[PDB]
Design an enzyme around this catalytic site. Structure first.
Site, PDB file in Angstrom:
ATOM      1  N   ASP A 522       0.806  -1.214   0.000  1.00  0.00           N
ATOM      2  CA  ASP A 522       0.000   0.000   0.000  1.00  0.00           C
ATOM      3  C   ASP A 522       0.844   1.270   0.000  1.00  0.00           C
ATOM      4  O   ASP A 522       0.290   2.368  -0.107  1.00  0.00           O
ATOM      5  CB  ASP A 522      -0.943  -0.004   1.205  1.00  0.00           C
ATOM      6  CG  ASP A 522      -0.220   0.231   2.517  1.00  0.00           C
ATOM      7  OD1 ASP A 522       0.729  -0.522   2.818  1.00  0.00           O
ATOM      8  OD2 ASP A 522      -0.603   1.169   3.247  1.00  0.00           O
ATOM      9  N   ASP A 610       6.466 -13.678   1.288  1.00  0.00           N
ATOM     10  CA  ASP A 610       7.009 -13.614  -0.068  1.00  0.00           C
ATOM     11  C   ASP A 610       8.000 -14.744  -0.332  1.00  0.00           C
ATOM     12  O   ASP A 610       7.983 -15.365  -1.405  1.00  0.00           O
ATOM     13  CB  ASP A 610       7.668 -12.253  -0.299  1.00  0.00           C
ATOM     14  CG  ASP A 610       8.421 -11.745   0.920  1.00  0.00           C
ATOM     15  OD1 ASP A 610       8.390 -12.426   1.965  1.00  0.00           O
ATOM     16  OD2 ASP A 610       9.029 -10.659   0.839  1.00  0.00           O
TER      17      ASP A 610
END
Ligand SMILES: *[C@@H]1O[C@H](CO)[C@@H](O[C@@H]2O[C@H](CO)[C@@H](O[C@@H]3O[C@H](CO)[C@@H](O)[C@H](O[C@H]4O[C@H](CO)[C@@H](O)[C@H](O)[C@@H]4O)[C@@H]3O)[C@H](O)[C@H]2NC(C)=O)[C@H](O)[C@H]1NC(C)=O
Ligand SMILES: *[C@@H]1O[C@H](CO)[C@@H](O[C@@H]2O[C@H](CO)[C@@H](O[C@@H]3O[C@H](CO)[C@@H](O)[C@H](O[C@H]4O[C@H](CO)[C@@H](O)[C@H](O)[C@@H]4O)[C@@H]3O)[C@H](O)[C@H]2NC(C)=O)[C@H](O)[C@H]1NC(C)=O
Ligand SMILES: *[C@@H]1O[C@H](CO)[C@@H](O[C@@H]2O[C@H](CO)[C@@H](O)[C@H](O)[C@H]2NC(C)=O)[C@H](O)[C@H]1NC(C)=O
Ligand SMILES: *[C@@H]1O[C@H](CO)[C@@H](O[C@@H]2O[C@H](CO)[C@@H](O)[C@H](O)[C@H]2NC(C)=O)[C@H](O)[C@H]1NC(C)=O
Lengths: 686, 686
Positions: A522, A610
């Site tokens: 974000d 990730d």
């Protein structure tokens, strides 16, 4: 003898109606009280949870009855077992579309159904004689070892080093018997390589079929020696009428569990699930006359091929052998595939959209049902993730040739220059490439950063190929009513998470209507032209992670462990999902097929999601990711050490390091090229 | 019944001794005068030329006797055929290690060996009853259609468009018969799609087995209708004892020849070579009870999947069905693979080195013999080029994981920074990557450019990873004795060509000791740093063409044909071998496995050899090439039009356009990046 084309009723099983299964409750029949309790318990638990199972007996395509391994000594008589079978409520007159399941756990000498008439019913078990095996109709299944228990990967030895203490090992007690014994004893005596071959049991032998090599000791005793051996020897029974025995299957199970590559002497054997599985990829099968050539053959094989065999054996064991649920699913899938019915669709993550105060084209779904179950048989059964689920899309779907879009299959294609090609202009006016037109969805995870979220969402205004933006609200507190969300030209959907977790960004949300997902933090800053070029590259590389941030893994010599590194480097191994494209398929895999331990660790450190996705995608493809541009920044210490620990644990979970290095990145063709004045660059700065 | 483990003598056939075959001369036995002359002629021609065949009967592992299709009516009696078999010179007492070959050409009702005792011999033929088929021991083979004739690809219709005039077709004349007839007639009447189904023959039917659908008319009559049909229907015989018939095999042959995807009704059939081939990838096999669902199923399949099926059928037909030589090679390869012996090594181009007046490490060879024949069974038999040759190297060899080089398999590896990674320095000091250390060989074609050759060779002085330079002398006149060749630090080997041809640059010269080949024109200018980065990329992309010059193919709408284009472009499809890396494997394929017509065309125009290699590599991999740097130049009109014609002809030869577009090129990771002062770029200008 019964075959699927003269004893199966296809009228009950249309291709489109799914695969409804009815399971008898064995407690309501004489079998129930004599069953081995753990087998009964595990089977009932897994059948209760299965997606295909129905309580409506009238619509069922298949009927399942568990007669199971019985308590020793077997009180029940074959005739009375037959009497109970022929009395089942829906055993109409002959038992068509019935499968009789007899799972072996503790006994390797039980052969319940040998003197039993089964009519037209199929039989799934681990022991067969030639007089009672009907190829293509009956099923050879693995024994039920881990009943009401879990196999932990932490006790499996690592796949590397390839060579272990012993080249091969054998333990057993009991025409080629003398030949084999003499040859292997000679191999042991010569001591060109270390082997441990025993033809008597130090610990009391287990009861065995008349002409079979008996298992020695307990299961824990055997694994100790198998963990130290590169290969595991499996000598088949001398009786020519014995097709497969529970003992040989148990040996195969124990070898595959700890990474010892099976070496089978005897080709007449039918291994479990052999109709679907290419056992040659995971085991060496050698005729007994060639026993004198086994040592040379085992010495000749290369390290990489042997390691590939070990990896394939690990895959097969985990997918089809490890649990009762896997065995039951494999039985159902074999029967369903034989009669050419597709698998059940995989579940999506239904979500509640948080209301807020402020043309999309959706990719087609489920276009390859029959192809995937029948035509792509080999890939479905011998490559991860396996055959148990039907996905709406897949990154391995075949692409059309260049000519088809012009000669009758042009629906959805947008060629560059109409097929004549061209320079920057014609390039910017159409997607081009080898696949039809496409859009992508942005998935954004946010937490206590309410303001930067507004700014970043505003930056997305005007993206040419954006379908919608999905904002995954992780905070326990809902967004305030006074927060004005920007109008960026595409729908913004705020989805409510049931618990705070970084794994939520890879949930296959129902709101995602596209194959491609752009995963962005974000607070990340990406220019529109970088995103578009990355999208084109991904369209060309649908099975890879394509993204901007790069990292690599390094070896720590003093500790013989791995390190996470983020310096600038000339070679890379990871592309962080903080800004990266990937296929939604991998979201399904991450959420529902990847091991649970990895997700639990992600939750524990509230970090390393990730790295897990890079591990997964490299494991599936065995290819490194793609780095898209020249940029390295897109604007604590414990947060950094946690990642070393994450890498080490993931290596433990997988059994090996799946990451691979790349020494190059990708750029546009005419990037920084001196063009003639008529031509134009594909991108101004990319 | 005989099986390979109780009727084959492995003592004659060691794993390392090759696969020597002895073929009986049928002219010296009573069979010879009754054989169909064309079958006899073709079989003798192919056996004479085969590499495995020997005249030394004492060393032979296998013995081959042709009893063949006999002239109609069959004069010979079964008992006398048996009498001749048991009298063969090396039919010791039972005929072990013998294969009896009976090829069908003209008759579909001949069943010579039905009442004949064959002892322990294997039988290869096209018609079997259940009482005489022994699975895993006998061989089902295709009929011999093109005897003493060549199948020309020019008459095969193109693979695209996917949908043809008719959805499916059937022609035949003669329990589910009435059901099938009614269902298919209803499909025809409804006219949702165009079909042509005939259950009587307009042209007199061919004689057939009692319960089989008879072939109508002549072979030319059938192909005319099959060329117009997307699918081809194959209804199996009603007799349950008939395993496979010559008629059904003939139907399958004719369907695969012209690209009509076979649809088989009946699963009990054994298709040719079914033990090795995954027929599900090329044909749809449907139970007769499901005939009512066939129309829906055929309408459901997608264009790309159907096209993939057509392509796989083309591959199978060309590799295993088309010629007598292919049939014989397939029989020998099936038997050799069943007993686990590797294929014969492929021949190299021995060359004379032209003497002239002025440390290399060679890559290991033949490391995967057993793996390739047994472990990689599926890829060997179901993917191009096929199983008939053993190559010294292969670009698809599995790579080791990152950890292995540190934990017991580090031989030959050169990690960057010892495994810690690093910046430009550590990058320039070691190759790194995922595979062991490697060198490359430069291959240079020269013709009447004696001086530029000296200068270009001098420019190669000091290349870090150069093994040797191979200069292919094409000119009819030899180099002069006064020409002083430079001393560039590596051997220069001048090889004499037997005729002037551009195909000579892709000959697998014996002098090439490396997997990698750098193909460079004698007047090209490449900097050392471009070559090295390209070498690293190729090491990462061993199965691709990796090179500097780029071109692309374009569609000409007014003529519905392809054009060759060399403007600057934002997307590419070809990398010219004027400066490119590729694997030597492709040189073997180009010289010995690629169709002869392509090489003949290259000779005719003395042009388009690079386009042919791009076609080949894209056909094998279905992936586009890799463009390495930003440069586009490295310093007649008919020469330009010839290339349009070359592209069109190659499309005709292959049946489709195999080229694919790429919209990106590759550069070094830290290329044009702003580094901190401690770091260094991987290359100064690349
Ligand atoms: C940029 O690159 C440099 C050089 O590679 C890199 O510095 C290195 O960092 C690692 C990690 O901090 C260091 O290795 C550690 O050293 C400490 C002692 O100082 C040890 O305790 C560590 O061992 C633990 O972790 C292991 C797993 O990784 C366990 O197996 C072990 O049992 C311990 O629990 C570990 O060895 C290394 O010494 C330095 N090297 C140098 C030359 O400084 C730096 O981190 C990189 N920077 C970034 C931002 O990536
Ligand atoms: C750079 O790009 C331009 C634009 O694409 C390109 O110009 C084009 O060249 C092609 C080839 O010369 C032209 O197409 C031909 O036009 C002639 C008539 O002028 C026709 O006779 C040709 O048809 C023959 O060839 C076909 C196979 O290619 C056969 O199927 C056919 O039956 C004929 O035998 C062909 O249509 C095209 O008109 C131009 N276009 C423009 C706008 O000029 C140029 O060649 C490129 N330059 C380089 C160096 O690549
Ligand atoms: C391929 O399989 C999918 C999944 O089973 C089918 O999709 C279902 O189709 C039925 C009938 O139209 C719907 O009632 C379901 O809601 C669909 N499920 C989902 C998840 O969308 C699809 O119809 C099949 N396609 C074929 C057979 O061509
Ligand atoms: C793999 O196969 C190759 C090719 O047959 C073998 O190479 C031959 O080995 C024999 C014995 O050493 C030599 O006499 C031949 O000259 C070799 N042929 C070539 C073309 O080099 C090789 O030995 C095999 N490797 C194994 C079985 O490990």
């Amino acid at each position: 003898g019964c075959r699927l084309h003269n004893c199966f009723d296809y009228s009950r099983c249309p291709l489109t109606s799914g695969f409804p299964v009815y399971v008898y409750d064995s407690d309501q029949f004489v079998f129930g009280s004599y069953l081995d309790p753990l087998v009964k318990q595990a089977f009932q638990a897994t059948a209760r949870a299965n997606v295909y199972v129905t309580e409506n007996a009238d619509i069922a395509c298949l009927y399942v009855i568990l007669v199971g391994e019985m308590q020793e000594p077997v009180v029940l008589r074959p005739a009375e077992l037959e009497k109970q079978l022929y009395s089942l409520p829906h055993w109409r007159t002959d038992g068509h579309n019935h499968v009789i399941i007899n799972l072996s756990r503790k006994s390797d000498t039980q052969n319940l159904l040998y003197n039993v008439s089964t009519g037209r019913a199929m039989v799934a078990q681990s022991t067969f004689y030639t007089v009672q095996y009907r190829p293509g109709f009956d099923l050879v299944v693995s024994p039920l070892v881990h009943a009401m228990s879990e196999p932990n990967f932490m006790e499996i030895p690592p796949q590397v080093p390839v060579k272990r203490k012993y080249l091969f090992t054998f333990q057993g007690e009991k025409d080629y018997d003398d030949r084999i014994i003499a040859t292997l004893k000679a191999v042991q005596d010569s001591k060109l390589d270390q082997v441990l071959v025993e033809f008597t049991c130090k610990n009391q032998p287990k009861p065995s079929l008349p002409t079979e090599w008996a298992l020695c000791g307990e299961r824990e005793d055997r694994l100790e020696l198998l963990k130290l051996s590169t290969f595991a020897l499996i000598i088949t029974p001398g009786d020519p009428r014995l097709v497969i025995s529970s003992g040989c299957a148990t040996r195969l199970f124990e070898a595959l569990e700890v990474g010892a590559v099976p070496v089978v002497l005897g080709e007449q054997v039918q291994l479990p699930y052999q109709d679907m599985l290419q056992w040659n990829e995971a085991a060496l099968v050698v005729p007994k006359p060639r026993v004198t050539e086994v040592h040379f053959l085992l010495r000749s094989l290369s390290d990489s091929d042997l390691l590939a065999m070990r990896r394939q054996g690990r895959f097969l064991w985990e997918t089809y052998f490890s649990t009762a649920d896997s065995i039951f699913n494999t039985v159902l899938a074999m029967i369903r595939t034989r009669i050419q019915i597709p698998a059940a669709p995989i579940r999506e993550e239904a979500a509640a959209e948080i209301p807020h105060r402020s043309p999309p084209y959706a990719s087609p779904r489920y276009l390859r049902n029959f192809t995937l179950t029948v035509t792509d048989f080999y890939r479905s059964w011998n490559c991860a993730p396996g055959p148990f689920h039907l996905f709406p899309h897949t990154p391995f779907d075949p692409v059309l040739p260049s000519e088809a879009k012009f000669l009758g299959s042009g629906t959805g294609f947008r060629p560059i220059g109409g097929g004549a090609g061209g320079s920057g202009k014609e390039f910017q006016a159409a997607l081009g490439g080898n696949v039809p037109r496409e859009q992508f969805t942005v998935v954004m995870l946010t937490y206590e950063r309410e303001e930067v979220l507004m700014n970043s969402l505003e930056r997305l205004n005007g993206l040419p190929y954006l379908n919608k933006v999905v904002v995954v609200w992780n905070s326990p507190k809902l967004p305030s009513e006074d927060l004005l969300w920007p109008d960026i030209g595409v729908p913004i959907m705020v989805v409510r998470t049931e618990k705070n977790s970084l794994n939520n960004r890879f949930l296959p949300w129902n709101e995602i209507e596209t194959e491609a997902i752009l995963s962005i933090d974000d607070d990340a800053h990406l220019r529109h032209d970088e995103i578009m070029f990355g999208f084109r590259v991904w369209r060309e590389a649908r099975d890879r992670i394509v993204g901007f941030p790069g990292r690599y893994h390094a070896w720590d010599i003093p500790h013989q462990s791995w390190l996470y590194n983020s310096n600038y480097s000339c070679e890379l191994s990871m592309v962080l999902t903080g800004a990266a494209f990937f296929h939604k398929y991998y979201a399904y895999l991450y959420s529902y097929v990847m091991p649970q331990a990895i997700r639990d660790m992600v939750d524990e450190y509230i970090n390393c999601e990730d790295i897990a996705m890079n591990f997964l995608v490299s494991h599936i493809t065995r290819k490194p990711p793609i780095k898209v541009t020249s940029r390295w920044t897109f604007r604590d210490d414990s947060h950094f050490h946690e990642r070393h620990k994450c890498i080490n644990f993931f290596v433990k979970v997988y059994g090996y390091m799946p990451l691979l290095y790349t020494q190059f990145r990708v750029d546009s063709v005419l990037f920084k090229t001196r063009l003639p004045h008529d031509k134009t660059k594909c991108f101004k700065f990319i």
